[PDB]
Design a protein around this ligand. Structure first.
Ligand SMILES: [Mg+2]
Lengths: 478, 464
């Protein structure tokens, strides 16, 4: 038997695209893929790759059958925190004791069922964690109200609705609430979660059962937030991939990984599956010598040569150039294909806009669909990228010309705004695609309301042409 | 020992941009500079360069004086064909759109008496599979007393059909081409000796190069032979730089006077090319930002022995500054009539631009230039030209000065149509922000050009 049959997918993953399993897909379009992430903290790209591979290297060939252990976990977060001096806290790879870490969460990174689950985590209650609406400070947030104070667990379903309602009133992408992690017993809870995992994982028989257990526990970790820094990479970009590859699944290439706090375990399974699905299509497209176009980003040959020259990781080289113990580098593949087949099922018009490029397939998919299906906006709980969007919005942000054409043919509503206030037009302007902008405007002008539609403002009070006029000048943070 | 001395400006011309004196400036934006011209005839750039340099190496050498003889004219061609010889009876013809014509130019064309007696044809017609079937030929029973009134009507007729549309055709002379070629040669050498100032000399040079073009003595490559090669010889003989052109194919229906202005700005281009390269300033003329890969591709493709000899020729036997100040004063003619428009084409510095547009009135900022001005200006506002050049700085200041962005040029197109066609999201955005704060926004966005197309029709095609 092997231990990490997943390593197979890691080795198959095309080297010049390996940055994709560390840079969130949401940055690729606007930051020339990996370059923006690289410039904000150079070489973390390697460091992150070196961490995964070196950790996975001392697993697939040791132990008995694997059991998770806190020491491993810490053994992980030793990359990458500062690690530099001086005092008085903390060991650049050790655990928080009383140190307080906090961050905010916008409605678009949350779900009602997710909030319900969050409030239900008992260690947050007894550990002294804080969560609620408030204000962000230079030394912590200032809460207007902390829900973990005097929390009646009978009231959590009603409370979860209210919280979600409040977060939306503030804005889909706006940070209103805040979370301050536990300041008591992190070592205890870290061990509790580890034991829970190793207990439950052994009960699960199917791969879907196992996924549920993996994401449920990875969440608890993240929410637990045991380190001073880099809890997200340490768990979701690194740790999550170990149980995934232990089950013989590929590692995850995420659009937006930062939903392991206020999404529910069930909804996270979906998030991880579509992430996984993304590693599979990366590999397939590269195998078929097809240019990779995911998430509206087209890598230039100069960007690719800059990255492989920059690529530098001994443990990655060892995994790329290894033997194929086997057997089943093809069941491995058929196993994950059956596991991911649950995706196709729900809101396919949106997934089509993201992943489909063949005009014939697209035309077929949109046949027999009604006005409400072609105009459907996906609701809370779906993976972040879908919430509030029509297939049209997603066609524009992917650059899916074929899909946009068919949607226009099917007389889709291009005036509808997603929960950021943006219409298909705001996105076309932001993407700087002259053609898709033109197609949309041709349609908009042949309608009654053309001026009202062109003057639509989003959550920044901006019109589509505000963004258009801004295209190609540089960003402006916070 | 120099004359010709102009060979000084050819050497100064930056090697990796030397294609610019062969590829029309109108192609650069939409054909990645030189690459589109090269792909239609591979090797044609080096052949044109080899022709100019090889022929210029034989002239400065013995001619003292020099003489544009029909022998060198034939030798020029001999280096620009499948073949070196003259036409006898073979018909050669082409069409001309109003935008390549002027009223004064048409007057002059009808006045070329060799076109009347030689049997050349020109009037409204249609394009044939072996020749144009003309509806009228103005050279038949032409009263030369009526040519000023006829020239106005021909121009109006060419405009009714459309600024960029071809209604009128020209079939060249089929009798006595060898005779007329010799007549023009003798006329040139006679008249050039009469002229004293550089402006007088220019008038004579362009007038004769025009006549050489209009008489289409060769089967092929009359343009390359007479305007991209021959024209540069008398120019350099006078100590002027060779000419870089936006659109030069105006040596038929433009007048000699107006062609002087066309050549002056073509020369101005060579001066701006050299200056920008000397200052290490990248080049952004007419809309082509050459990529480093393109430059390397051209540098590797460059291959012309006679060019190499001129690039390493020693012009220590010559005063560059006399030469330089002479062409300086000659070109200081340019930025006077319609100054802005030229600003929109050439100016990139926001400070200079802001200064230039200070205390200009609504009629100056909205001014559309009339027929006879070099092709690129005709019918356009400064705003149109800012958009086609990608002159962001100029467009910004024009918007600040509340320029009218609804005004359409003689192709029916507004600043918006051009922004769509150029595919510039930013300039399109700036324009639309303005248009929507106006009462007439919908009427303006729906403006159709000569092709009945709306700005967004072009936008939706962008990337074809
Ligand atoms: Mg905070």
């Amino acid at each position: 038997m092997p231990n990490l049959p997943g390593l197979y997918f890691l080795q198959a993953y095309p080297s010049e695209e390996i940055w994709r399993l560390f840079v969130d897909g949401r940055f690729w379009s606007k930051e020339n893929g990996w370059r923006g992430y690289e410039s904000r903290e150079p070489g973390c790209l390697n460091a992150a790759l070196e961490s995964l591979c070196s950790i996975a290297l001392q697993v697939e060939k040791s132990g008995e059958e694997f059991e998770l252990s806190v020491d491993l976990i810490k053994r992980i977060h030793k990359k990458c925190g500062k690690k530099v001096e001086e005092l008085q806290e903390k060991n650049p790879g050790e655990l928080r004791t009383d140190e307080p870490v906090s961050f905010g969460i916008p409605a678009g990174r949350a779900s009602i069922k997710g909030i319900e689950e969050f409030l239900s985590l008992v260690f947050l209650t007894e550990g002294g964690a804080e969560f609620g609406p408030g204000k962000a400070g230079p030394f912590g947030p200032r809460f207007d109200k902390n829900y973990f104070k005097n929390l009646n667990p009978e009231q959590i379903p009603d409370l979860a609705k209210q919280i979600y309602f409040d977060m939306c009133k503030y804005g889909h992408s706006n940070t209103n609430h805040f979370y301050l992690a536990v300041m008591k017993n992190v070592d205890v809870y870290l061990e509790k979660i580890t034991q829970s995992y190793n207990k439950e994982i052994k009960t699960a028989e199917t791969l879907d059962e196992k996924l549920k257990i993996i994401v449920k526990h990875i969440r608890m970790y993240e929410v637990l937030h045991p380190f001073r820094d880099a809890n997200g990479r340490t768990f979701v970009n690194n740790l999550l991939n170990i149980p995934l590859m232990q089950q013989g699944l590929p590692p995850a290439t995420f659009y937006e990984p930062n939903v392991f706090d206020l999404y529910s375990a069930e909804e996270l399974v979906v998030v991880v599956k579509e992430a996984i699905f993304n590693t599979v299509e990366i590999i397939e497209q590269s195998k078929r010598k097809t240019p990779i176009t995911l998430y509206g980003y087209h890598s230039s040959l100069e960007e690719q040569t800059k990255f492989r020259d920059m690529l530098d990781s001994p443990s990655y080289e060892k995994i790329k150039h290894m033997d194929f113990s086997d057997l089943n580098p093809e069941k491995l593949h058929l196993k994950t294909q059956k596991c991911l087949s649950s995706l196709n099922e729900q809101y396919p018009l949106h997934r089509g806009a993201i992943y489909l490029s063949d005009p014939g397939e697209i035309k077929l998919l949109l046949s027999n669909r009604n006005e409400s299906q072609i105009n459907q906006q996906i609701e809370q709980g779906a993976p972040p990228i879908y919430v509030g969007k029509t297939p049209a919005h997603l066609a524009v942000i992917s650059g899916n010309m074929a899909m946009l054409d068919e949607l226009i043919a099917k007389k889709a509503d291009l005036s509808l705004q997603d929960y950021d206030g943006k219409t298909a037009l705001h996105y076309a302007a932001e993407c700087g695609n002259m053609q898709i902008m033109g197609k949309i405007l041709k349609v908009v002008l042949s309608q009654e309301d053309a001026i009202k539609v062109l003057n639509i403002k989003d959550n920044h009070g901006k019109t589509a042409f505000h963004y258009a006029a801004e295209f190609g000048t540089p960003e402006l943070i916070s």
